[PDB]
Write a protein that binds this DNA or RNA. Structure first.
Ligand SMILES: [K+]
Ligand SMILES: [K+]
Ligand SMILES: [K+]
Ligand SMILES: [K+]
Ligand SMILES: [K+]
Ligand SMILES: [K+]
Ligand SMILES: [Mg+2]
Ligand SMILES: [Mg+2]
Ligand SMILES: [Mg+2]
Ligand SMILES: [Mg+2]
Ligand SMILES: [Mg+2]
Ligand SMILES: [Mg+2]
Ligand SMILES: [Mg+2]
Ligand SMILES: [Mg+2]
Ligand SMILES: [Mg+2]
Ligand SMILES: [Mg+2]
Ligand SMILES: [Mg+2]
Ligand SMILES: [Mg+2]
Ligand SMILES: [Mg+2]
Ligand SMILES: [Mg+2]
Ligand SMILES: [Mg+2]
Ligand SMILES: [Mg+2]
Ligand SMILES: [Mg+2]
Ligand SMILES: [Mg+2]
Ligand SMILES: [Mg+2]
Ligand SMILES: [Mg+2]
Ligand SMILES: [Mg+2]
Ligand SMILES: [Mg+2]
Ligand SMILES: [Mg+2]
Ligand SMILES: [Mg+2]
Lengths: 41, 97, 124, 46, 41, 26, 205, 181, 133
RNA sequence: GCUAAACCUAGCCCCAAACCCACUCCACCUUACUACCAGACAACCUUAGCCAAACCAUUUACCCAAAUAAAGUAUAGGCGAUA
RNA sequence: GCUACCUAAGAACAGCUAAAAGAGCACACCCGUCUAUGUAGCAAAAUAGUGGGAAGAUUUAUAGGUAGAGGCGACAAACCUA
RNA sequence: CUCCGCAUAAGCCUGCGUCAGAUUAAAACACUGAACUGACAAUUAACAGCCCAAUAUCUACAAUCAACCAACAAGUCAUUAUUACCCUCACUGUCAACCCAACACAGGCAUGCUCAUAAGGAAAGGUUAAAAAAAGUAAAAGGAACUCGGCAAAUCUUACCCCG
C-alpha cells in the first residue's frame, strides 16, 4: 500500500493566511513565511 | 496545484457478494470437523508461505531452499544478494546488542 | 562518429571496398588476367517470351462471372485425374505390373533431366 | 596541444577492429554478441 | 508532463476550392478522391 | 492522480466559497 | 498498406482519410474505448436494414441503416439522431447548414418485424435448405439480409465489358489437361525450343 | 514498341478508367500452363503501364486516375504465381516426396539457437571448401547460460501478456455486468 | 528474376532461361535534357543492362543500341516523430538509346455559384436583413 | 489576465497454473546480412577479492534436491570472530 | 584510428653558399623559446608577434603488431582515446 | 582583401537544385534568402575499383639527366621449359557549400597543379567619438637614469665566465 499526502494544500494555507499582510516573498512562499509567522506569534 | 479540481467517481461497494458473504466460513474446520483438517491448509498462495510467518531474512532464506531450484537466474542472483545484505544488517548493524 | 545503424553499401568505404561490393545482380562471367572480363552467353538468363497474337485472355475479367469456391490442388487430386485412368484401363485389360510404372508416367530418378524437381535447377 | 580529435575515421580499421568477423573469432567476442542480443541491441557490431 | 506548444493562427489566405487545389499542386500535396457509400442526407 | 475523496470534497467546498465571494448572490 | 497503432480509435471518418490523419496522428495516445465483444456470427445488423431507435433525441422512429462500424459496434441511420453542422464553409462565407447523423450503439436500436412494424428481438436459425437466417422471437418470421450496393460501386446487372476485360466465355473455358510435366517442360515443347546439352551435377551444402 | 508503356491515347486526361475484376486463383486452375505463361506477359505489360502512370502522376503532382487497377493486376499476378507453384509442388511430392524444393537442414549456430540452413550450390565437396569450413554449426558450453537467459526473457513477456488479457476481461465485466453467462 | 536461386552453370551446360520474369520496369520522364534517341527507365537493383536489352527486345520488340545504368541514393535524412530516420528506397536508373534512328519524346499523359451570393449592405449598419419589418 | 493547473488510462509488480522450444521467397562467420572452387585452427583446468575479526597474517554463512522437529545440539575454530 | 616504440611497402624537402657535411642563411613543412591578449575562450591549451630546426637520429599518409599482476619508454615515474 | 584556389585520396552520405511553406537566419520591417520541413528531380565510363591455369626452373653487377667521378648506410621493378586454354566489354564508385573537434568552432587535415592568380572572397547593423582596456603609428632634450633582469620595443653589436 502506497500512501501519499492528499491534503497538503490546506496544511500550508493555515500558515499563509497569517502572512497575507507581510511584505515580499514571505507572504506567498511557505518556506519563507513559516519562519516569519512563527516570529510574529 | 497537486490537488484535483473535480470529484472522483463514486466508490460503490457490494457488501453482500459471494466473497464477502462467505468470508470466514470453514475457519473452524478442525474444531467442528474432528480435526481432520487444519485451518492453515485453507491458505492459498506461495508454497513457501503457507501456514508460516517470518521476517524478510527468514522469508528469503525459506524461498531459496524451497523453490530456489526453479527460480530465474536473474531473480535468484538478486535473492542471494538480498540475503547477504540482510545478514549484515541484522547481525552487525543496529542500536541494541 | 560512424553510423552503425545504417545499411552497409558499396557507396561506403575506400576504392577497394566500393568495387568489391555489389547490389544483388547475378554474375554472368569471370575476370581473366589483365582485369579482362569474359561474358558467358549460357550464364545470361534467356527470356522465353511467347507469341501473344490471337490470345483471348486479357488483364481483367468481367464481373458477370460466378463466385466459384477455391479448391487448392493436391498431389492426390493430380494423381487421380491423370495417372489413375491409365492404371484402371491396364488393370481391367489384365496387364499391370510395377516394372512398367515408368511407362505410366512415374520417374524413378531426376538425373539425366534438364528440369529436375529436387533440387530444382530451373528458374520460375 | 588541443585534444578531442582522437577519432580519425577509417572504415578498414573499424571493420577489422570491432567487426562481425572479429567478434566471432574469439569466445569472448561471441559473448559480446550474445549480451547485445539478450539486451535487444538494434546493432550488434560494426 | 502536460506540455503542448501551439503556434499562432495561420489564417489560410485562399478561400476558393480551385485555388486550394491549384496551390496544393504547387506544393506537391496530393489528395486522392474519397471512397464511401454513405452520403449526406 | 492521487487516490482519496476527503481532500477533493474539501477542496470543492473552498471553491464554492471563493465563487460566492467573487460573485455574491442577490 | 494498413498502419494502425495498437490503440487506434475508430471513428465516423474512414481510416487513412485526410480527416482521420489530422484527427489521429501517429503520435497521439488516447484512452481506449471499451467495446462489448460480439461474435461475427452473432452480429445481426447490416446496411440497408430498417431499425427502430429506442433511446435518443428522436426515439420510436424507424430508419434504414446506411453504415455500420464493427470495431465500435456502431449503427448509422439516415435522418435520425442528427445534429446540424455548416458544410462548405469559407473565410468570407459562413457556409451551408446540413443535418449530420450521429452513431448509435447496437443496444440503442432494435430491429423491426416485416409483418408488424414494431421492435422485435431475433435469434438465428436454419431453414430447410440449411441457409442460416435470423428469426424474430415473437411471431417468428424470416428476415432476409437486405441487399446493399457494393462498396466499389460496380453494378453487375449494368456491366459493359471493355477492351481489357476478358469475356465470360473465355474466362470460364477449361483448357487444362492434368499431366506430369512442369510449365517449363510443357512450354519448351510448344515454343519449339530444343536443348541437347545435359546439366552436370553440383553439391548442395 | 514503346507505345505499350502508356495507355490508349484517348484515355489520357481522363479521371476514371473502367476496369474489370481481377483473375481469381480458381479461374486460373482451368487454364493450361501454356495459356498461363502467355497470360503472365499480358499482365506484366499492363503492370508496367500502371507503374509508369503512377510515377508520372507524382511528377505532375496529380492523383492517379484509377489506382485500384494496379491492385487488381498485382492480385492477379500473385494468384497466377500461386497456381503454377501449386502444380509444381504437387508434382514434386509424387516423383520425389519432398516438401521443399531447395535442400536444407536443421542446425545449431555458433550462438546456440536453432536455425534452418538453406544449402547453396557449389562445385567442390564441403571438405575441400576453405570458406565453408570456417563457418561453425555447433555451440560451446559458454552458450548455455545465455540460452537460459533468453528463454527466461520470453517467459516474462508471455506472462505479462497472459495476465494483461485476464485483467481486461475482469475490467470488462464492471461496465457490462450482463456478460456473466 | 529476383529473389530466386540461379541454377549453377558449368562448362558445356545448358543455356539458362527464365520463362516468367518478375522484373517490373517503369518508364520515367527525364529531369534534365536528353537526346531524342535516349530513353530513361527505373529498374530494380538486381537487374543488369544486358537483361534490360533482352527484356525490351523480347517483350516489347524494341531494338536498343546502348544501355547505361546508375544507382541513385535515397536520402535517409527524414526523421519521424520518434527522431528515427526514414529511408527513401535506393533505386536504379537506366538510359536506353534506340538503334535505327528512332526518336522518343515523353507523351503528355495529363492533358487539359460563387457569383450567386448576396453580401451585406454597408448602409444597413449590420442590422439583420431577414426581417422585412 | 498570461504562464499554467487538473484527469485515467496505457501498461507494470507479486503469486498460481502450466515445462520450454520456428517457418513466404532471397541474403547473412569474407569488410555478417556479399549467388559459384583444393580444404584439414578447434571445446574442457581449484574463482578471487571487498567485507567481519573493530589492524591483519589461519579463518569469515552463500539454494544443491522433503516443510516441521531433533538443533543452533554433537562438532569445528588465531578454540577468537564466527561456522 | 590519440599517443609511445616497432613492421611492411610509399611520399615530401624552393632558392643561395659550400659542394665534403647528423654544415650555414632561408620558404614549404615540423617543433613551441620569449612576450602580450585570451581564462565558461575562436580553443576542455587557442590567437598575434618573436623564435628553434628545416638532406636528416628529418617530417609525413596508409595498413598491421605489442594490453593493464601488462605494454612502450634517447627515465620526464613520460605515454597507452581530453 | 586574396589567409588562397581547382582537383585527388580519405572521410561523410543528399546536407543552399526546382516547386511550396505557418518553419528559419539580426532579417514577416515591405520583399529577398535558406543549410529546416514537405514534394519532385539527380551522379550515365573511356577515369577508378573488382584480376591471373599447373609444375619445375631462372633472377652476382643500385639509384643519382648515369656518361666522367666518388662513395656507403649496399639499395623498389627482369624469366625459361612443357602442358592446358577461340564466348569476350558484366558488376560497383561518380551529387553538395562536405571530414575530425558537443556548434554553420579564429583549431586539426595527406598528395598534385597554380606561386599570384583566369580561381575564391568582405574587416564597417546605424550613430556618437568619455574613461579604463586592447592593437598600432609618431614624438622635443636626454638615452637603460626603467627593472629581479635592456622584459617589450628599436637597432643590427664587443668581449668573458659557468654547465654540457
Ligand atoms: K543487529
Ligand atoms: K582496515
Ligand atoms: K581554437
Ligand atoms: K595497430
Ligand atoms: K556528408
Ligand atoms: K572572383
Ligand atoms: Mg557506372
Ligand atoms: Mg577487519
Ligand atoms: Mg589500515
Ligand atoms: Mg593519425
Ligand atoms: Mg621498414
Ligand atoms: Mg634545399
Ligand atoms: Mg643542417
Ligand atoms: Mg640551420
Ligand atoms: Mg622518442
Ligand atoms: Mg629522474
Ligand atoms: Mg621524480
Ligand atoms: Mg579502365
Ligand atoms: Mg566531383
Ligand atoms: Mg562584415
Ligand atoms: Mg565583426
Ligand atoms: Mg564603426
Ligand atoms: Mg557597431
Ligand atoms: Mg584612453
Ligand atoms: Mg623621444
Ligand atoms: Mg639600474
Ligand atoms: Mg649600454
Ligand atoms: Mg631604480
Ligand atoms: Mg627582446
Ligand atoms: Mg647540450
Amino acid at each position: 500500500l502506497r500512501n501519499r499526502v492528499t491534503d497538503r494544500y490546506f496544511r500550508i494555507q493555515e500558515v499563509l493566511k497569517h502572512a497575507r499582510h507581510f511584505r515580499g516573498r514571505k507572504n506567498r512562499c511557505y518556506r519563507l513565511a513559516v519562519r516569519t509567522v512563527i516570529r510574529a506569534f | 496545484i497537486g490537488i484535483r479540481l473535480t470529484l472522483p467517481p463514486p466508490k460503490v461497494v457490494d457488501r453482500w457478494n459471494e466473497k464477502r458473504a462467505m468470508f470466514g466460513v470453514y475457519d473452524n474446520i478442525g474444531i467442528l470437523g474432528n480435526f481432520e483438517k487444519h485451518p492453515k491448509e485453507l491458505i492459498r498462495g506461495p508454497i513457501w508461505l503457507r501456514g508460516w510467518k517470518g521476517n524478510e531474512l527468514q522469508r528469503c532464506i525459506r524461498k531459496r531452499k524451497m523453490v530456489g531450484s526453479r527460480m530465474f537466474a536473474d531473480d535468484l542472483h538478486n535473492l542471494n544478494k538480498r540475503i547477504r545484505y540482510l545478514y549484515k544488517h541484522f547481525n552487525r548493524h543496529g542500536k541494541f546488542r | 562518429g560512424a553510423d552503425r545503424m545504417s545499411k552497409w553499401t558499396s557507396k561506403r568505404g575506400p576504392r577497394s571496398f566500393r568495387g568489391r561490393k555489389g547490389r544483388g545482380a547475378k554474375g554472368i562471367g569471370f575476370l581473366t588476367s589483365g582485369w579482362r572480363f569474359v561474358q558467358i552467353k549460357e550464364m545470361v538468363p534467356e527470356f522465353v517470351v511467347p507469341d501473344l497474337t490471337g490470345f483471348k485472355l486479357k488483364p481483367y475479367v468481367s464481373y458477370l462471372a460466378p463466385e466459384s469456391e477455391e479448391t487448392p490442388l493436391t498431389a492426390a487430386q493430380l494423381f487421380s485425374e491423370a495417372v489413375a485412368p491409365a492404371i484402371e484401363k491396364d488393370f481391367k485389360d489384365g496387364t499391370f505390373d510395377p516394372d512398367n510404372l515408368e511407362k505410366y508416367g512415374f520417374e524413378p530418378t531426376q538425373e539425366g533431366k534438364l528440369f529436375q524437381l529436387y533440387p530444382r535447377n530451373f528458374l520460375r | 596541444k588541443a585534444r578531442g580529435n582522437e577519432y580519425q575515421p577509417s572504415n578498414i580499421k573499424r571493420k577489422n577492429k570491432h567487426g562481425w568477423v572479429r567478434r566471432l573469432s574469439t569466445p569472448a567476442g561471441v559473448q559480446v554478441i550474445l549480451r547485445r542480443m539478450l539486451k535487444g541491441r538494434k546493432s550488434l557490431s560494426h | 508532463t502536460k506540455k503542448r506548444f501551439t503556434p499562432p493562427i495561420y489564417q489560410p489566405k485562399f478561400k476558393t476550392e480551385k485555388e486550394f487545389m491549384q496551390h496544393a499542386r504547387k506544393a506537391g500535396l496530393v489528395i486522392p478522391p474519397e471512397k464511401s457509400d454513405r452520403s449526406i442526407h | 492522480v492521487k487516490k482519496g475523496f476527503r481532500a477533493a470534497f474539501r477542496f470543492q467546498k473552498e471553491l464554492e466559497r471563493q465563487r460566492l465571494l467573487r460573485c455574491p448572490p442577490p | 498498406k494498413v498502419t494502425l497503432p495498437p490503440h487506434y480509435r475508430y471513428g465516423m471518418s474512414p481510416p487513412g482519410s485526410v480527416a482521420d490523419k489530422r484527427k489521429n496522428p501517429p503520435w497521439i495516445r488516447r484512452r481506449p474505448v471499451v467495446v462489448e465483444p460480439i461474435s461475427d456470427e452473432d452480429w445481426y445488423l447490416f446496411c440497408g436494414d430498417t431499425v427502430e431507435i429506442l433511446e435518443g433525441k428522436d426515439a420510436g422512429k424507424q430508419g434504414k441503416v446506411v453504415q455500420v462500424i464493427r470495431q465500435r459496434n456502431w449503427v448509422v441511420v439516415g435522418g435520425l439522431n442528427t445534429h446540424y453542422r455548416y458544410i462548405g464553409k469559407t473565410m468570407d462565407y459562413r457556409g451551408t447548414m446540413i443535418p449530420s447523423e450521429a452513431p448509435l450503439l447496437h443496444r440503442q436500436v432494435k430491429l423491426v418485424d416485416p409483418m408488424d412494424r414494431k421492435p422485435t428481438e431475433i435469434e438465428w436459425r436454419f431453414t430447410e435448405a440449411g441457409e442460416r437466417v435470423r428469426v424474430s422471437t415473437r411471431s417468428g418470421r424470416i428476415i432476409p439480409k437486405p441487399e446493399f450496393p457494393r462498396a466499389d460501386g460496380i453494378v453487375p446487372e449494368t456491366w459493359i465489358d471493355g477492351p481489357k476485360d476478358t469475356s465470360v466465355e473465355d474466362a470460364l473455358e477449361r483448357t487444362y489437361v492434368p499431366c506430369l510435366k512442369t510449365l517449363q517442360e510443357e512450354v519448351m515443347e510448344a515454343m519449339g525450343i530444343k536443348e541437347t546439352r545435359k546439366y552436370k551435377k553440383v553439391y548442395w551444402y | 514498341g514503346l507505345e505499350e508503356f502508356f495507355d490508349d491515347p484517348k484515355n489520357w486526361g481522363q479521371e476514371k478508367v473502367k476496369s474489370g475484376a481481377a483473375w481469381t486463383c480458381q479461374q486460373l486452375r482451368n487454364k493450361s500452363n501454356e495459356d498461363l505463361h502467355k497470360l503472365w506477359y499480358v499482365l506484366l505489360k499492363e503492370r508496367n503501364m500502371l507503374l509508369t502512370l503512377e510515377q508520372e502522376a507524382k511528377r505532375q503532382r496529380l492523383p492517379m486516375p484509377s489506382p485500384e487497377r494496379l491492385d487488381k493486376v498485382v492480385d492477379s499476378m500473385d494468384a497466377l504465381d500461386k497456381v503454377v507453384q501449386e502444380r509444381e509442388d504437387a508434382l514434386r511430392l509424387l516423383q520425389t516426396g519432398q516438401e521443399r524444393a531447395r535442400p536444407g537442414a536443421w542446425r545449431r549456430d555458433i550462438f546456440g539457437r536453432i536455425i534452418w540452413h538453406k544449402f547453396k550450390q557449389w562445385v567442390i565437396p564441403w571438405h575441400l571448401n576453405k570458406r565453408y569450413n570456417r563457418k561453425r554449426f555447433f555451440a560451446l558450453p559458454y552458450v548455455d547460460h545465455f540460452l537460459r537467459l533468453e528463454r527466461e526473457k520470453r517467459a516474462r513477456i508471455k506472462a505479462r501478456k497472459e495476465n494483461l488479457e485476464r485483467k481486461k476481461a475482469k475490467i470488462l465485466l464492471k461496465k457490462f455486468p450482463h456478460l456473466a453467462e | 528474376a529476383r529473389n530466386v536461386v540461379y541454377p549453377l552453370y558449368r562448362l558445356g551446360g545448358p543455356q539458362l532461361r527464365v520463362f516468367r520474369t518478375n522484373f517490373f520496369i517503369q518508364l520515367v520522364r527525364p529531369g534534365v535534357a536528353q537526346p531524342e534517341d535516349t530513353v530513361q527507365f527505373r529498374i530494380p537493383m538486381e537487374m543488369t543492362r544486358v537483361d534490360l536489352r533482352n527484356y525490351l527486345e523480347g517483350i516489347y520488340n524494341v531494338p536498343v543500341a546502348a544501355v547505361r545504368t546508375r544507382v541513385q541514393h535515397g536520402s535517409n535524412k527524414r526523421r519521424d516523430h520518434r527522431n528515427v530516420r526514414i529511408k527513401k528506397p535506393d533505386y536504379k536508373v537506366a538510359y536506353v538509346q534506340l538503334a535505327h534512328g528512332q526518336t522518343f519524346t515523353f507523351p503528355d499523359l495529363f492533358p487539359e455559384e460563387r457569383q450567386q451570393r448576396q453580401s451585406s449592405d454597408p448602409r444597413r449598419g449590420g442590422v439583420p436583413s431577414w426581417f422585412g419589418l
